[model samples]
Target chain A: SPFRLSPVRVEGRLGQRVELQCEVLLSSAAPGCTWLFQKNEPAARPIFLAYLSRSRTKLAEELDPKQISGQRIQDTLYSLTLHRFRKEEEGYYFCSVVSNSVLYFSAFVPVFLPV
Target chain B: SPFRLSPVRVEGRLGQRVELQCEVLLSSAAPGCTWLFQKNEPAARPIFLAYLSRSRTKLAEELDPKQISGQRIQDTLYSLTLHRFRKEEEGYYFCSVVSNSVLYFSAFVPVFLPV
Candidate 1:
């Protein structure tokens, strides 16, 4: 069987903090997972922004409090918190698990009306 | 300061094999890196395909002897080999290093003339 997750959606003001949740289901446990961000633009590359583990811990490189952001909450649930969300932050956000050389993407959350 | 590498490009016939390499430059060592495949199409999601490590080892999810593919070699150099390439295999390939919560992408290799 393949891994899977529940779909989450949230609406917030332009500068408010919103959390989108991801739940992982598997027979056995895995180490960690990655979060990817895709903007609404047509020609931009989807950025690998953050990573989290089963311990509900987060490892982030850069956090733009005024743009878009994310974090991990529980062992099976990973959340991305968009602080001060802008129209530019509206797009598809995906969480993925990388194991044994294959990357499996969870269902994505699409943010509309960023303001 | 950021990690970097020299770019390499190779060409082969439709059924022949080709290798694309990625090198990591850092004062301290890291665990592993990921390889991504972006087909030449609009509105399509880029696929997180394979991963490599410093041990000159590889972990692959699926290997198609035909179409397009990749692999790894050596500690600092990661290679993606495409066997029996097809016209659809033409696109950009990127290598990324994940540390802490940040994912950094090296320069990508563009494949053209898929015949």
Candidate 2:
């Protein structure tokens, strides 16, 4: 649904209220596996976050603490809306799919790649 | 001495507490300035939080929010700590120092290259 947090860029005062959006770039329910916060590099780390959940047949499988947030959009078209965006500015994001599990990842969003 | 975020990398379960230590990599006091945060180039965003400061000049100037929290080590040495990290992982970081009210950036940990 998302190509990576989309908009992919925003500029603001170091502490302003910014909004970011990410989508699975899906129009239908497509799931093989999905991906979060880190870029594709094996040596990256996401910001910090707490929970994740999807709202469908959701889980016959699972990843970890950073996958999907309630599948808030609920569809193969995964989407992420970051309103309470953090103060840090500038970053890279990417999207990947897992083999199973209802995931969106702040684990997903916290992640990004250099596409 | 850090040349980067130094560790420049880490891995975790998405919700665990991860600590990254960065150094200006200076042995003495070199000030064109130094930093924290996003990667290089132009469109990457960092996570959030409270404050940033150095024990050197202490409050010679400024930066902005979601910048997170920090403390001083010895004299010119310093440390930053992030809390309630969030549900997000897989993000980027950078930091830098400023000269003459110009500490405005990751600021590449935004670095200064013979400026």
Candidate 3:
């Protein structure tokens, strides 16, 4: 399986709904995946957002469950959706999935907003 | 100082010389910065490459000083140059500078190779 992310770039305005997807390009039985948020700060640590497991999707405490959600689009594909994107949400996002006790990371998907 | 990086995306062929630059957008006395390499692997740890300090540029043990080099372009600008880029060198490249003991990171500049 290729450890990669799709839609290299995403550009949207405030209050827009944006969906970011990640996958191992697998066919079946993919494990849970987590979405991470990195603010546009110097040496900022990435914040874990939503974790979409095989059972259910759980969101981070800092996020409103209604504003941010995760869904399994397919057997191996997962997506994180932002109902109303904000300026603070503009930065970098990437996904990770652990399979067989090994972690796989996807390339970062940069989110840009209007000036 | 604007914490931003320029030429956000770099595309080059194998064996080509590529220069990735970063700056705090300062006018003077910008401290040293270091370049980082993240291979296109599963959750790969970022490897610190060359350190271009105010005093001098020191390269990592794994890198060849002749092929990989760093230079201070301007008062606040610094650059990492790959003399002959290789497949292993084709990955994400970003720079970080420490000023007043605070670490600031530039937006990652993705490097691509010809398919």
Candidate 4:
């Protein structure tokens, strides 16, 4: 069966939470979802951040949202918050889509700055 | 099924070529291999890089070796060369692993300097 997946788009104010969403299509018998952070090369490192099952559902949960795991604060909005603000936190954040052991990925570009 | 994958390691001098390699374990029914580059966050944009198959046997090939694909110049050593020398071309470069539609990834950190 064919699959459809897209990157998470993000928008937020400084010091606020920003949610990036990635959608996917899978069969009813498919497994759960997984999240990963793909860092740049020379500094290349893919950290297996988190995963969730379909049977266990939650509208919002906090899994170290400060450092990892996008927190869902609103519908279709997974919020990643930066406590204070800094310039170094500027770069690409990818939201990889996985299902039934198959994998597809999409990325979001976040522009964070001081207010 | 269980899967295993590792990040490509790199080492090169300034103005020289560098190649990063990733190895994976899969059965006979596995599909071709795909490559990707995950840039830094704040600069979060994952670029869809390249792919290869087994039947298409070639121990070596030249991709956009100058700026893109990792070129093989030595045994198990892919070369990514910089014609002149620039400090900005020094960031993280990642090598991802895929098999049977599954995705696993590993990364290598490169340290470039002048001689």
User: What proportion of the real contacts between chains A and B does each prediction keep?
Assistant: 0.36, 0.02, 0.00, 0.14
* Per-model CA lDDT versus the true structure: 0.62, 0.36, 0.69, 0.42
RMSD in Å for all candidates: 3.9, 19.0, 12.2, 8.9
Q: What is the lDDT of candidate 2?
A: 0.36
Which residue window of length 10 is worst by lDDT in model 4 chain B?
B1-10
After superposition, which runs of candidate 3 have C-alpha atoms over 4 Å from their true positions?
A26-30, B1-115
Residue-level lDDT for A58 in candidate 4: 24
Question: Which candidate gets the maximum DockQ versus the true structure?
Answer: 1
**Stretches of candidate 4 above 4 Å error?**
A1-20, A23-35, A38-44, A48-93, A97-105, A109-115, B1-11, B25-30, B38-44, B55-89, B99-102
Model 3 score (lDDT): 0.69
What is the number of residue pairs that collide in model 2?
72
Q: What TM-score number comes out for model 4? A: 0.43
**Candidate 1 local accuracy as lDDT?**
0.62
CAPRI-style quality class for the chain A–B interface of candidate 1 = acceptable
TM-score of each: 0.74, 0.30, 0.48, 0.43
The local lDDT score (0 to 100) that residue A26 gets in candidate 2 is 40
* Model 2: per-residue Cα lDDT over B56-81, one tens digit each: 32321233223334554433445554
Candidate 1 lDDT, B3-78, residue by residue in tens: 3444444454666666677777754545777777766554446667676664544444465534445455666667
lDDT of 4 at A54: 38
Error of 4 at A60 (Å): 18
Worst 10 residues of 1 chain A by lDDT: A1-10
Report the lDDT of model 2 for residue B39. Answer: 44
User: What lDDT tens digits, residue by residue, belong to model 3 across residues A1-115?
Assistant: 4455777788898899998888766443335677777666543544678767667676776788778888878767888888999877888888765333223456668797967
